[PDB]
Design a protein around this nucleic acid. Sequence first.
DNA 1: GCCGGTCGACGGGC
DNA 2: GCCCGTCGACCGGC
Lengths: 241, 244
Amino acid sequence: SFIKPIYQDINSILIGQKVGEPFEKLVYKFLKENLSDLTFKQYEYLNDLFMKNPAIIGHEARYKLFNSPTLLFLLSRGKAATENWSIENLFEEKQNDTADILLVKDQFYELLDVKTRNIAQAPAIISAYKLAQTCAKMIDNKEFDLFDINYLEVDWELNGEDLVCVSTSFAELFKSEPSELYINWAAAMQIQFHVRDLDQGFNGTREEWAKSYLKHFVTQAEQRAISMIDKFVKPFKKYIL
Amino acid sequence: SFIKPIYQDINSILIGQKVKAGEPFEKLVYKFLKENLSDLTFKQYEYLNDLFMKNPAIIGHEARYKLFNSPTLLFLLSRGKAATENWSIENLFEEKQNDTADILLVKDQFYELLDVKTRNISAQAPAIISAYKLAQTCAKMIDNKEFDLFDINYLEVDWELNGEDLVCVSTSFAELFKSEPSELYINWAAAMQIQFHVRDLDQGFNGTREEWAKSYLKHFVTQAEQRAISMIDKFVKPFKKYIL
DNA sequence: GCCGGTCGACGGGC
DNA sequence: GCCCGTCGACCGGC
Ligand SMILES: [Mn+2]
């Protein structure tokens, strides 16, 4: 995390700003103004990577520029989009992209999401399944010291016509207890939580985090299958008889 | 249906119209219907505001819920205790993008819920209704024998890009209750949404609406059982090896 | 709050 | 095209 060591600073600049989505642009702005050389939006990182490798043409070749199957899986775009890419056909911000912001330096990747809220309902974080896949690849490729998925919550309060930042929170996914992670299966299998109160006491490595998270996903997967029978089958059986 | 009879007209008018998202086409259908079927044509929050406004005596969520005279229709169109509780002429409903129906058409205690879909040409099949929402609707239709009360219909607006602007090329009309229920594709991960292309929706179901409900509920259940099972191969089987 | 279902829009494999 | 995940934004019952 390149953000933790300057989170003091980020908090204080964010506290008192006024406009809740417009808030993440102020996080980007600040980070770009202060960590310029390592601050990227995801489509921007991809553009930079590919521009800097003009000889690397076509999807299969460019897929090799990541030299990480986990990072190829989290950060890369699809075969065709990676094929059709050129200096005249650059990538553009897409919501479907994994990270709000990318911070990279000395081969380390900090995937960062900004979450904005008033004072209610837990946002989508990542597909529980997409995470399981991330973990599997981590473990398979022993990529335990490559990336973090961290979060920044901007808490705002209404004010006339303005919205004002009351406070900020920061959390690191790999510092959380995997089993405390709420999975909303129906809602695109999205892990949901508020950054402000995501547990931060996990005392293992990313390897132990990945194993522990796979245990949780597998567990909940089993639990959902069972829950589906109780919720979606049993009650409706009486109408077929 | 109140638009089935006038569809060649909505089709007449829409085809050939330019727009400089694809969504503003929904805007043109609403304008057309509001003008040619003024009293029937709503938008779920309009009807909601309307139903309550013309009943100033009826106050609070329970009393207002009675206004619907239909468990099944309540389910579809209602806004929940607090929203219904704090509704007034100084706190009217506004359209939410997670309401049931884009457009509501109503005459003589009959309801036509109309969704508008818009598209290019070989696009993703869009969300229709939560398979589970529909499962509850059907059950409610049956528990309460409400088989002649509402239809769920769709209008598809096909556009092609023409330089800066989009030009309506064709349109489609289809009825959910005329589709063969067992053909309805349920995308479980994506909010349990049944997805289909309106244009391709088959319309050869011949039976009571009851038979459609019973037949839908057969599909939903079969599909649910299959999904739960498939979670084991999709989400358990591949990750077991990682358990230490 | 916690839980979890709903509508939208889109990617992206084959 | 079909299949079906992934990210947004949201509701609304306890
Ligand atoms: Mn975001």
